[PDB]
């Protein structure tokens, strides 16, 4: 209905950049600095690979053997099909050629039966060949005896009668720190426990390590090989080197029972390991990702990447080990390594391995028949894709990490689920920097910056995103984006084939932070016109702001981008962003602008130096403490610059100079406390009391935040119930009818004012009074409990006086307005929170005996006092939205603003009149009366309740209250002569026909609208002073017929009408 006029859904001052509790950010307070922990530069490479073999062919060790079967297969060789010299040739060969396939780009030393002194003259050459590179000394011990306690590897001697006692200690001194050994022999922990007793305990805080020597072993010291036909003699290197091919063989003999598909189809296997888009490749392509998503999630961070990420050969040894794991259990042995890590073996993810061999060896009766290509992909990739998208979307916390994130790693760059795995990447970097910490940790970077360089332009906006959350986390991908030449991509999605501006925020907010403090960077997109492309788009709020954080980040402390900027005409396209309504954007382009910067002289600069610092002055006076905080940095910057002059300036001062001058003074007199310390630190840049000294910009910190941070019922439900109390009240205030005024109070509250209540206000939809001293000391009380809830002071300056309070966002959590005597206000939220108040924003409005009034409707904030204007605030913009000339010549002593009708203002004066403003108006002044005819000030001015523009208005300090309506008649309506002069206050009600009126003897006298007198108070002096003149607090209730009423004494009394 049309009652809906009083009832605004009009919030103000609740954005981000006001913020509360728990962040201080909101521009005063620095970005949070970061501490990242996937920061590994030590990428180890394996250079030398020594194998021995010391396997005497038909010669069996006295060990235990015995079986008539007995398996001897080493390397996919029969040894008694050649001989002994021919064979152990092969079985080198062959062991090498497994081994080389893994690391290519390595030497390969192989040596067959040897003396003591021949593993001597390998080891030695193989530091000497690799000096701080890793070697890998594998031994094979299956044609001679076992290991000993002592620790003790046995080899031949010149003419194979003796085994020689080769000790781990002889070894071990000449392999040293980057080692890894594979021991394929029986009882393989005698030597891992003896390699454990060389070097003393200590040095880590682990279970039983200290060098970076890592270790290989078959099995436990009571344990031997085994002696199977189903197995080879060689089950332990085969796992480790041909992991493929063992473990087909393996699930053919122990699963399927072997007997139905052919065993030499998996010799026979179509395609090469590299290839993903064959069959032989897919399927060792899936062992590396089950495999290797076993490591992330069984082992800590620091031991799966030192293990899988540092090292290729390393990482690979240590996949194919988990095989080995698993298939030497059913062979009676347990195997170990020397960075022990826990049981991996039945793992719910072999599970799925176990399922896509099967899938594939059915295929492969069909795929060797005929190479007819019919090779289907298995769904491995798809299926856990789908997985990891149950978990981001039931389950979508902090509850044990995903466990497909390093399967999502391995789909990143295959076409068939590359777009969909960037997506729920993009969609799991979302959620937090946690979870970024992740991606990254896995291994995400190298894949993610290989994805830069796509002309696919369907990947490109979702690289924009994973960049963007990257990037908001750490800062130090820069370096990585500019060597690799990243910063192309970013420049050119500006420029945009696509669209969407909220895309390109993201974009230009990647181009910033590549950029921050990073000359390398700044040199990088200086080259490539990142000015050109961010100035083209000055000529959407989020894309604007940064357009100027990125720009100002180029410029930032560089000659050469600034001397660009100037002579690109930088000034002049930010320029118009200063009175943009978003002060987010508004405050970016001082920041920008405040960059470029640093006798009679003219070269280009100094038109562009001074053009820029008038444009500067003008925001000073900006609505938003976000602004000024950074104008006071623009003007602390060109201060230091223009140190010389500023001196010579303010001495006089104690064209542009005096004026630089001036903004400083304001700028240490601000109301916001964060911004007055900065005009403190720009006067003392002049002498009036080094780049530790210039004060720290914080709009691009606090701006970043957005971007760090995931991309209402119980709020809306409070609304409701609120807005029908207000319903029902105006109803009753409306009707019903008002009897007399009850003289016994419900309040003798003393406030311990030593001088006497000012001002106060009640809040309409709780028992709270809101009370002011005459030095602007802030005191809320419930008068329903009787009890303090809160005191302030508003600010802490020496020259005190209120002037004004005001509720705003009545209907959804208030916050207390404060106005000053001077006009600077003050707007404060959780106010009557035991001491936990903080200050939203403070603004000078008038740039005096200062008057205001707050209009929900519009948003709109009246100022004005003994000044020939009416200053006009939009809060939603923080603003200065037009200067009204009043037209009197006196001052405006009295001011409201129609609560019903937005842009509606009444103004009394220091003579008596009284003016009506349409503020929307292009002529402002509606009319212009004097009614009551003592030229005396008019101390108290209101709309009438209702929806009409009449009015109750214009107590005269003479003492007569004149009702009137501007419809009609210019004339008065009804008279009543409330007081024999000295009218000291005036009060009306918003809604019901009640109005009250203060005297400056005692006294206080209550009205109906139609002018009876339903009662009088008088307050008495307490000692012998006689001073009750300052009745200046009178103030209803919003929705009640209740009255709060105080004096020049000490207490607050609050009555009602029965």
């Known amino acids: 209905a049309t009652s809906m006029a009083y009832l605004p859904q009009t919030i103000v001052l609740c954005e981000l950049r006001h913020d509360a509790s728990e962040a201080s950010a909101p521009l005063g307070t620095s970005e949070i600095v970061l501490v990242p922990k996937w920061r590994l530069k030590e990428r180890m490479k394996t250079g030398c690979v020594a194998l021995v073999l010391c396997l005497n062919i038909t010669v069996d060790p006295p060990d235990v053997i015995k079986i008539s079967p007995c398996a001897r297969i080493e390397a996919w060789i029969d040894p008694f099909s050649m001989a002994p010299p021919k064979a152990l040739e092969t079985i080198g060969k062959n062991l090498s050629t497994q081994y080389e396939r893994w690391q290519p780009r390595a030497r390969y030393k192989v040596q067959l039966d040897p003396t003591v002194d021949e593993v001597r003259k390998l080891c030695l050459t193989c530091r000497k060949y690799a000096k701080t590179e890793r070697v890998l000394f594998h031994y094979n011990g299956h044609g001679v005896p076992k290991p000993t306690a002592n620790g003790e590897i046995w080899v031949f001697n010149k003419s194979y009668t003796q085994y020689i006692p080769l000790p781990i200690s002889e070894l071990d001194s000449w392999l040293k720190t980057p080692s890894i050994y594979v021991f394929d022999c029986s009882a393989a922990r005698m030597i891992l426990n003896a390699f454990a007793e060389l070097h003393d305990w200590g040095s880590s805080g682990s279970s039983g390590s200290s060098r970076d020597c890592i270790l290989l072993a078959a099995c436990d010291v009571h344990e031997t090989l085994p002696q199977s036909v189903e197995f080879p003699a060689d089950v332990f290197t085969s796992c480790l080197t041909t992991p493929i091919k063992m473990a087909l063989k393996w699930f053919c003999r122990r699963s399927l029972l072997k007997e139905i598909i052919d065993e030499s189809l998996i010799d026979r296997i179509p395609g090469r390991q590299n290839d993903r888009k064959t069959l032989l490749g897919e399927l060792n392509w899936i062992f590396t990702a089950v495999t290797d998503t076993i490591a992330w999630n069984v082992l800590p961070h620091e031991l799966f990447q030192r293990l899988f990420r540092q090292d290729l050969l390393v990482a690979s040894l240590f996949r194919n080990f988990l095989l080995a794991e698993r298939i030497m259990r059913s062979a009676n042995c347990n195997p170990i390594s020397h960075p022990m890590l826990p049981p991996t073996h039945q793992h719910h993810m072999w599970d799925a391995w176990d399922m896509a061999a099967e899938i594939c060896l059915s295929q492969l009766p069909q795929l060797v028949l005929d190479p007819s290509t019919e090779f289907q992909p298995s769904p491995f990739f798809t299926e856990q894709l789908t997985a990891f998208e149950v978990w981001l979307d039931h389950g979508s916390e902090h509850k044990k990490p995903p466990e497909q994130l390093p399967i999502v790693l391995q789909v990143l760059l295959s076409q068939c689920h590359r777009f969909r795995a960037l997506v729920l990447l993009g969609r799991f970097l979302d959620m937090g920097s946690w979870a970024v910490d992740l991606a990254l940790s896995v291994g995400i970077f190298p894949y993610v910056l290989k994805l830069l360089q796509t002309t696919t332009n369907e990947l490109r906006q979702i690289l924009v995103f994973i960049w963007t959350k990257i990037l908001a986390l750490d800062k130090s991908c820069q370096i990585d984006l500019v060597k690799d030449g990243g910063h192309t991509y970013f420049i050119r999605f500006l420029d945009s084939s696509g669209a969407f501006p909220e895309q390109r925020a993201m974009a230009a907010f990647v181009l910033a932070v590549i950029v921050d403090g990073h000359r390398r960077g700044q040199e990088a997109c200086l080259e490539a016109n990142l000015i050109g492309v961010c100035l083209g788009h000055l000529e959407e709020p989020l894309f604007l702001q940064w357009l100027c954080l990125c720009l100002g980040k180029l410029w930032e402390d560089f000659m050469e981008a600034q001397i660009m900027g100037r002579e690109a005409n930088a000034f002049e396209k930010l320029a118009p962003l200063l009175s943009e309504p978003q002060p987010e954007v508004r405050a970016a382009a001082v920041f920008a602008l405040g960059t470029l910067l640093d006798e009679f002289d003219d070269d280009e600069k100094i038109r562009a130096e001074d053009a820029i610092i008038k444009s500067l002055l003008d925001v000073v006076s900006d609505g938003s403490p976000l602004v000024r905080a950074e104008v006071a940095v623009a003007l602390a910057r060109f201060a230091f610059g223009h140190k010389q002059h500023l001196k010579l300036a303010a001495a006089s001062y104690w064209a542009v100079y005096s004026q630089c001058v001036r903004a400083m003074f304001a700028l240490a007199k601000d109301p916001s406390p964060r911004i007055a310390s900065l005009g403190r630190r720009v006067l003392s840049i002049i002498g009036i009391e080094e780049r530790s000294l210039l004060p720290l910009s914080t709009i691009y910190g606090w701006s970043c935040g957005h971007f760090s941070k995931p991309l209402s019922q119980e709020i809306a439900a409070k609304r409701e119930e609120k807005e029908k109390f207000a319903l029902e009240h105006i109803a009753k205030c409306q009707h019903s009818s008002i009897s007399k005024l ?217 003492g007569d209250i004149q009702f009137l309506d501007l419809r009609t008649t210019r004339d008065t309506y009804l008279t009543i002569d409330a007081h024999r002069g000295s009218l000291t206050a005036l009060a009306v009600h918003r809604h019901a026909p009640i109005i009250a009126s203060g005297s400056a003897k005692q006294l206080i006298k209550v009205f109906s609208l139609q002018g009876e007198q339903l009662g009088i108070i008088r307050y008495y002096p307490s000692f012998m002073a006689q001073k009750i003149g300052s009745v200046s607090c009178l103030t209803f209730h919003p929705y009640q017929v209740l009255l709060a009423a105080g004096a020049a004494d000490s207490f607050v009394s609050i009555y009602t009408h029965d």
């Open 742 to 958: 009850n003289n016994n109070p419900i309040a003798n509250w003393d406030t311990r004012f030593e001088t006497g209540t000012k001002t106060a206000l009640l809040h309409p939809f709780s028992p709270i009074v809101v009370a002011a001293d005459e030095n602007e000391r802030i005191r809320v009380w419930n008068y329903e409990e009787a009890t303090l809830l809160n005191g302030f002071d508003n600010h802490d300056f020496p020259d005190k006086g209120i002037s004004k309070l005001c509720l705003i966002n009545e209907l959804d959590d208030s916050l207390l307005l404060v106005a000053s005597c001077d006009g600077s206000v003050r707007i404060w939220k959780n106010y009557a929170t035991k001491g936990k108040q903080k200050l939203v924003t403070g603004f000078s409005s008038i740039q005096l005996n200062a008057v205001v009034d707050w209009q929900q409707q519009s948003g709109y904030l009246y100022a004005s006092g003994e000044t020939s204007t009416v200053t006009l605030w939009d809060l939603e913009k923080e603003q200065l939205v037009r200067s009204v000339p009043s037209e009197s010549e006196c001052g405006v002593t009295a001011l409201s603003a129609s609560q019903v009708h937005g842009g509606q203002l009444a103004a009394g004066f220091a003579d008596g009149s009284l003016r009506l403003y349409d503020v929307r108006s292009p002529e402002p002044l509606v009319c212009a009366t004097r009614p009551h005819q003592k030229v005396e000030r008019v101390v108290g001015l209101s709309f009438q309740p209702g929806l009409d523009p009449a009015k109750v208005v214009s107590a005269s300090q003479a």
